[PDB]
Design a protein around this ligand. Structure first.
Ligand SMILES: Nc1ncnc2c1ncn2[C@@H]1O[C@H](COP(=O)(O)OP(=O)(O)O)[C@@H](O)[C@H]1O
Ligand SMILES: [Mg+2]
Lengths: 57, 375
């Protein structure tokens, strides 16, 4: 049982490391996508402004 | 921040306050004319005890704060909002006190005497200001236009002023104000969208649809023909994406919203459309200068940022007036800020530095005498 408990603790620590790494990975991906989506929204709003400028003629 | 003793040009136009130092070409502090007061009472501890939001601080939060308009049709409703917006502009954005430089404010044509006396009293007694001056918007707009002849059409948010100036001469008898502008257009669009199916009855949505109108709504070149061709829509109807994400679909309503200006009967008022009122004003002027007023008509106001107003004006005036002469309509770029721009170029003259009103003479004379001195 001592051997089994030590093995179990090692694998549990491995899984904890895994969840931590995945949490950083998802936080970074989310930030990158937030920046890109803001870029897209800005592009769309500027395009709407352009469209009204051409209609103004 | 400022090393020149020059007046602060603060255009307190209905719907948008535009404040900045003299000499600049555009206002630095531009924020809507709205006041957000806390609706409920919170048991929370730590938040700002501030009981009166203003400007962008209120725009950022419109769901919690009940929104009140500090100006209606032109008449000032609440003076606390006035003190709030000036105190905010002075001690939150410009970072300068009014005790070191003058202040050239711009007021609308044909305003009440109570409004003028009240603002002047708040600017002299409460705040220590070395000198004040009230100016009509039309003259400064004509200055920024770079001419001396024409009829300025200033369409703000709740009032529309037609002011004829020929050979650099004001006509206080012909200035006729009519309370048809962006708010009545927002109300018309709101009721027709409620007719479409999406019903709302709160002010935050009203401001949102106002912004949607500013961005998309345009003027039609032929109302009935566009109605007929929009009956079977394809590219005439557009699908807008609300900032929240709800997919709105708006078709003909766009170019039928500003049409209420041309047909006040939609709001059940006997008043005539802006074009017909301007035409009647031209008949009220003398014949000799009427052609010059036709050739030098100028526009002002944020409401004029819609695309298609110049062409609509040209066709309507051509249909009303003869088609023998030449009737060119000129709209200077960035006309909305032009008024403010004028203020800047008006505050740099030494003579204008000699036409200010200091505290002492006002105090002895009183506000009413000050009204006589200006006009
Ligand atoms: N960029 C814009 N596009 C369309 N309409 C606008 C814009 N800015 C302001 N407006 C309209 O103009 C009105 C406010 O005009 P205002 O700021 O009083 O003009 P001015 O400052 O020249 O007097 C509002 O009803 C608003 O809907
Ligand atoms: Mg205006």
């Amino acid at each position: 049982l001592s051997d089994k408990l030590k093995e179990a603790e090692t694998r549990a620590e491995f899984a904890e490391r895994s969840v931590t790494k995945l949490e950083k990975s998802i936080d970074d991906l989310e930030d990158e996508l937030y920046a890109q989506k803001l870029k897209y929204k800005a592009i769309s709003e500027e395009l709407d402004h352009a469209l009204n400028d051409m209609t103004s003629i | 921040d400022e090393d020149e003793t020059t007046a602060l040009v603060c255009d307190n136009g209905s719907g948008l306050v535009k404040a900045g130092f003299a000499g600049d070409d555009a206002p630095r502090a531009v924020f809507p004319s709205i006041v957000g007061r806390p609706r409920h009472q919170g048991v929370m501890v730590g938040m700002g005890q501030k009981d009166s939001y203003v400007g962008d601080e209120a725009q950022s939060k419109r769901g919690i704060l009940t929104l009140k308009y500090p100006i209606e049709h032109g008449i000032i409703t609440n003076w606390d909002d006035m003190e709030k917006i000036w105190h905010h502009t002075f001690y939150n954005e410009l970072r300068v006190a009014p005790e070191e430089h003058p202040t050239l404010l711009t007021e609308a044509p044909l305003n009440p005497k109570a409004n003028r006396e009240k603002m002047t009293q708040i600017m002299f007694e409460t705040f220590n200001v070395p000198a004040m001056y009230v100016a009509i918007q039309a003259v400064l707009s004509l200055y920024a236009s770079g001419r001396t002849t024409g009829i300025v059409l200033d369409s703000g948010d709740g009032v529309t002023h037609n002011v004829p100036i020929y050979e650099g001469y004001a006509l206080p008898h012909a200035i006729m104000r009519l309370d048809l502008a962006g708010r009545d257009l927002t109300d018309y669009l709101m009721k027709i969208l409620t007719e479409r199916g999406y019903s709302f009855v709160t002010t935050a949505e009203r401001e949102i649809v106002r912004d949607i109108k500013e961005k998309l709504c345009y003027v039609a070149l032929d109302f009935e023909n566009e109605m007929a061709t929009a009956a079977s829509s394809s590219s005439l109807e557009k699908s807008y994406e609300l900032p929240d994400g709800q997919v709105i679909t708006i078709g003909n309503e766009r170019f039928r919203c500003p049409e209420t200006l041309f047909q006040p009967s939609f709001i059940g008022m006997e008043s005539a459309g802006i074009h017909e009122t301007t035409y009647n004003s031209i008949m009220k002027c003398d014949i000799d200068i009427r052609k010059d007023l036709y050739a030098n008509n100028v526009m002002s106001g944020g409401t004029t940022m819609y695309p298609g107003i110049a062409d609509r004006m040209q066709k309507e005036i051509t249909a009303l007036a003869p088609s023998t002469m030449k009737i060119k309509i000129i709209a200077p770029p960035e006309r909305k800020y032009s008024v403010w721009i004028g203020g800047s170029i008006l505050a740099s003259l030494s003579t204008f530095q000699q036409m200010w009103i200091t505290k002492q003479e006002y105090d002895e004379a009183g506000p009413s005498i000050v009204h006589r001195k200006c006009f």
